[PDB]
Amino acid sequence: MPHRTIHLFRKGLRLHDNPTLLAALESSETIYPVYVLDRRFLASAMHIGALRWHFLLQSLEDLHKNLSRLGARLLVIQGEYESVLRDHVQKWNITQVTLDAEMEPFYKEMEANIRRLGAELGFEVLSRVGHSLYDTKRILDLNGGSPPLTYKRFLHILSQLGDPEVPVRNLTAEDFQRCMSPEPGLAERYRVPVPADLEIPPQSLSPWTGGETEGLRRLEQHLTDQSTTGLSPYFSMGCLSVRTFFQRLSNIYAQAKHHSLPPVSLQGQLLWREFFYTVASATQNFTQMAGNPICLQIHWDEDAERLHKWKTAQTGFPWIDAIMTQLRQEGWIHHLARHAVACFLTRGDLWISWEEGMKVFEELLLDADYSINAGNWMWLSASAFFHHYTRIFCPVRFGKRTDPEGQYIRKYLPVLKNFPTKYIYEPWTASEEEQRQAGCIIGRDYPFPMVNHKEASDRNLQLMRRVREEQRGTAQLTR
């Protein structure tokens, strides 16, 4: 097998079900498994908070450990991807560059640029899809060329397509004997960087640890303990294959003689992911409002202070602030916690663009996912997909049903930990003497509520009603 190959990890930070890396190994005599840490590209294309960096560095360290166990290595190269490639195609006499075929426009532009560079430097470019359950083009083809815009129509198309794609085989030590992974000269240049190298606090205090190893452990541990799986960061980073997880769930359904539906329900979660991936792959301007053909055009308020309070857990609604605090401190929050804060920010209370919430979630979520994040933010703002706009989450009462003593609030907002339960969700209703007894003066130690919920939601309902009465055709696209 003739090629000398660089495999570029972008997502797909895993050795199981990695079709591109497998294709690289099967076509090559020499391989350099590379992660390019390109601060300029990342600065131009995304927003990445400290917890996300920690999770990435952990996933890269794990990939390096796992590659090393097979007699290979991970090479982390810090630089601009085009200049890195020009240098190392020369250094290593590269004839093929492989990379996962991601659907995100910034990854597609990178891929386009690498293919142009290949035509110039003399390397072929090979990419395989490892991020989706289905061949997205086949879904579009069955739907007439456009993406299904409802989950119902999506499931109808999938029922014509059949089963998802199956995972490819695991990589073996024998793969790296047939296709050698040479130790480059100056191999210290290619170490996974430590947090200090990224100007980031050295201690990761998120209960999540990145990497394929932990993703697989969690995956197997969830199937043993059985609250959701908590696997989203691993799917978003590609430490875990959705095709592998889907098939694992099919295996359980098979061993239960088709009598266990909880694995089927969980497969449905992956199908929601596929739904948004499919819409996102074929919709112009998917991650913004303007120019987005499925998105209601809503004159959201430009109020950076309102956004600032929401982002920094200073809304004065403890349920909202506790959730935003968990997001900031841990990088993951439950699906319905995301509903609560996203509705509050957008159609419910603050009337701030879903684009701004999306960007905050992008910075803070370990599982930040281009397609999922935008699709769900359009959903939670009733900009597309969701149409029950008279239903607004109550930032006080929703948590009361869930957690009447406010243990979650007391955990994430310790300033409120001594508030009697009758005030824990609305501490501004306590008398000043009760505030003094709790050791927490509202407006000083914890803010007053930034809006009157009833007034704000009343006003926003009227605005949303006008939008939907005027933009009927756009609303109907996703109904």
Ligand X SMILES: Cc1cc2nc3c(=O)[nH]c(=O)nc-3n(C[C@H](O)[C@H](O)[C@H](O)COP(=O)(O)OP(=O)(O)OC[C@H]3O[C@@H](n4cnc5c(N)ncnc54)[C@H](O)[C@@H]3O)c2cc1C
**Other C-beta atoms within 10 Å of 292: how many?**
19
> With binding defined as CB under 6 A, does residue 361 bind ligand X?
yes
DSSP 449: P
Site map for Mg ion, 172-211, x if CB under 5 A? ----------------------------------------
- Which 308-337 positions form the footprint of ligand X (CB under 6 A)? 334-335
Which span (45-53, 185-193, 291-299, 370-378) binds ligand X, by CB under 6 A? 370-378
CB of 468 to ligand X, least distance (A): 20
d(CA 102, CA 8) in angstroms, rounded, equals 12
- The answer to whether 402 and 414 have CB atoms below 8 angstroms apart is no
Contact with Mg ion (CB under 5 A) among 44, 93, 228, 285: 228
Which one, of 26, 29, 35, 39, lies nearest residue 7 by Cα?
35
| CA dist 209 → 76, 234, 317, 332 (Å) | 19, 10, 30, 12
Give the one entry of Mg ion, ligand X, none that residue 4 binds, where binding means its C-beta sits below a cut-off of 5 to 8 angstroms depending on kind: none
Residue 339 partner contact from ligand X, Mg ion, none using kind-dependent CB cut-offs of 5 to 8 Å? ligand X
Maximum CA extent, the chain: 80
Number of residues that bind ligand X (CB under 6 A): 27
Is 421 a binding residue for Mg ion by CB under 5 A? The answer is: no
Q: In this chain, which of 243, 338, 359, 410 binds ligand X, going by CB under 6 A?
A: 338
**Among 243, 242, 263, 241, residue whose Cα is nearest residue 252:** 263
Tell me whether residue 21 or residue 372 sits nearer to ligand X (CB atom). Answer: 372
Residue among 156 and 335 whose Cβ is closer to ligand X: 335
Return the residue of 327, 352, 380, 467 that touches ligand X, per CB under 6 A. 380
Minimum Å distance from CB 217 to ligand X? 15
Residue 244 interacts with ligand X (CB under 6 A): yes or no: no
Question: 84-96 burial string, b = 16+ CB within 10 Å, else e?
Answer: bbeebbeebebbb
β partners of residue 32? 6
DSSP annotation string for 260-316: --HHHHHHHHHHHHHHHHHHHHTSTTTTSSTT-TTS-----B--HHHHHHHHTT-SS
- Counting contacts by CB under 5 A, is residue 226 touching Mg ion? no
Least separation in angstroms between residue 427's CB and ligand X is 26
369 binds ligand X (CB under 6 A): yes
How far is it, in rounded angstroms, from Cα 272 to Cα 280?
12
Q: Residue 151 binds which one of ligand X, Mg ion, none, with CB within 5 to 8 A depending on kind? A: none
Query: 385 near 391, Cβ under 8 Å?
Result: no
Distances (CA, A) of 157 to 102, 135, 138, 244, 280: 22, 12, 9, 22, 16
**Which range touches Mg ion (CB under 5 A), out of 193-201, 221-229, 366-374, 433-441?**
221-229
**Cα 158 to Cα 63: distance, rounded to the nearest angstrom:** 33
Residue type (1 letter), 16: H
Select the residue interacting with ligand X from 30, 95, 209, 236 (CB under 6 A): 236
For residue 91, give both structure tokens.
């250094």
Binding site per annotation, positions for FAD: 228-232, 269-276, 332, 335, 367-369, 376
Q: Output 49 or 263, the one with its CB closest to Mg ion.
A: 263
Q: How far is the CB of 423 from Mg ion (least distance, A)?
A: 33
Measured from the CB of residue 322, what is the shortest distance to Mg ion in angstroms?
A: 21
360: nearest Cα among 313, 417, 398: 313
**Binders of ligand X in range 267-306 (CB under 6 A):** 269-270, 272-273, 276
The contact set with Mg ion (CB under 5 A) reads 228
The contact set with ligand X (CB under 6 A) reads 228-232, 235-236, 269-270, 272-273, 276, 334-335, 338-339, 342, 361, 365, 367-369, 372-373, 376-377, 380
